[PDB]
Design a protein around this ligand. Structure first.
Ligand code: GTP
Ligand code: SAH
Length: 262
């Protein structure tokens, strides 16, 4: 014993055969159709309203449910191509969005499309956020966390993220959404519950997430129990390994429109 359910799921995950993992990573998950979005971005239709990545539909799913209500100044730590930034520009109460990513050889460089509100969005690449000082903001976004086959490695990097956002949350942002890659260890649930008492909010699982990751999102509009919501998600991914394979629930990708904003 000694293992959490999430630590049990990870061990079983690492022991699946090639196809067993292949047919499981998207068994029963929701997924937006990205075929026509890439073809228009590959060609260059910047005013078609196409999302730059799958991150737009994931963040949209959270906002269309009030899991957070962005407004005012928005900071997007780890913007990559800008899926979260280009969607936040379409929110009415949002007035300004600033993005920061690393980019480089093995990372995503920001894309410049013109969906609705593109003129208020800036994406500065080559920025290490862990060495960047925190600014006062209205809403804070963070989608940083690379996957590892080791739960202890995912633990360490997830903790590095939550310490970094500690000074950003200290700038009293009104709303926030922070990616929690590994929330299933004993220390994480201890850590997250400590940050919750202090900064509020709650942990949420997104159906668009693959079953190959235990990531959950720490949003400001939720008030779910720390240990209960994780264990519910740990049991979900475990139950999806045992039974028969399930189809993917496809849905239409988000369209962000076009045009400028004053
Ligand atoms: N048994 C098995 N487990 C894997 C494999 N690849 C990843 N896992 C696990 O998947 C976790 C995260 O996978 P990701 O690479 O981030 O995303 P993905 O679901 O694998 O998507 P793909 O890269 O297309 O396979 C890793 O931490 C590994 O623990 C594999 O090939 N076989
Ligand atoms: N220490 C760091 N500082 C700044 N950016 C980092 C970073 N570590 C990783 N990143 C970047 O953060 C990004 C997170 S993936 C972001 C995807 C985005 N939310 C979308 O919807 O498109 C990656 O592209 C990675 O290159």
């Amino acid at each position: 014993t000694g293992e959490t359910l999430g630590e049990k799921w990870k061990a079983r995950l690492n022991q699946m055969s090639a196809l067993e993992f292949y047919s499981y990573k998207k068994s029963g998950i929701t997924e937006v159709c990205r075929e026509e979005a890439r073809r228009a971005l590959k060609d260059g239709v910047a005013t078609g309203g196409h999302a730059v990545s799958r991150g737009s539909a994931k963040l949209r799913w959270l906002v269309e449910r009030g899991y957070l209500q962005p407004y005012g100044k928005v900071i997007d730590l780890g913007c990559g191509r800008g899926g979260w930034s280009y969607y936040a520009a379409t929110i009415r109460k949002v007035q300004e969005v600033k993005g920061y990513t690393k980019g480089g050889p093995g990372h995503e460089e920001p894309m410049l499309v013109q969906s609705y509100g593109w003129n208020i969005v800036r994406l500065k690449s080559g920025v290490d956020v862990f060495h960047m000082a925190a600014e006062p903001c209205d809403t804070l976004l963070c989608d940083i966390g690379e996957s590892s086959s080791s739960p202890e490695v995912e633990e360490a990097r997830t903790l590095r993220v939550l310490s970094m956002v500690g000074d950003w949350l200290e700038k009293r942002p009104g709303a926030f959404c922070i990616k929690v890659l590994c929330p299933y260890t004993s220390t994480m649930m201890e850590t997250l519950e400590r940050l919750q008492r202090r900064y509020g909010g709650g942990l949420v699982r997104v159906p668009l997430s693959r079953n190959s990751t235990h990531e959950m999102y720490w949003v400001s509009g939720a008030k779910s129990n720390t240990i209960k919501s994780v264990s519910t998600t740990s049991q979900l991914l475990l139950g999806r390994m045992d039974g028969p394979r399930r189809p993917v629930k496809y849905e239409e990708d988000v369209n962000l429109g076009s045009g400028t904003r004053a």
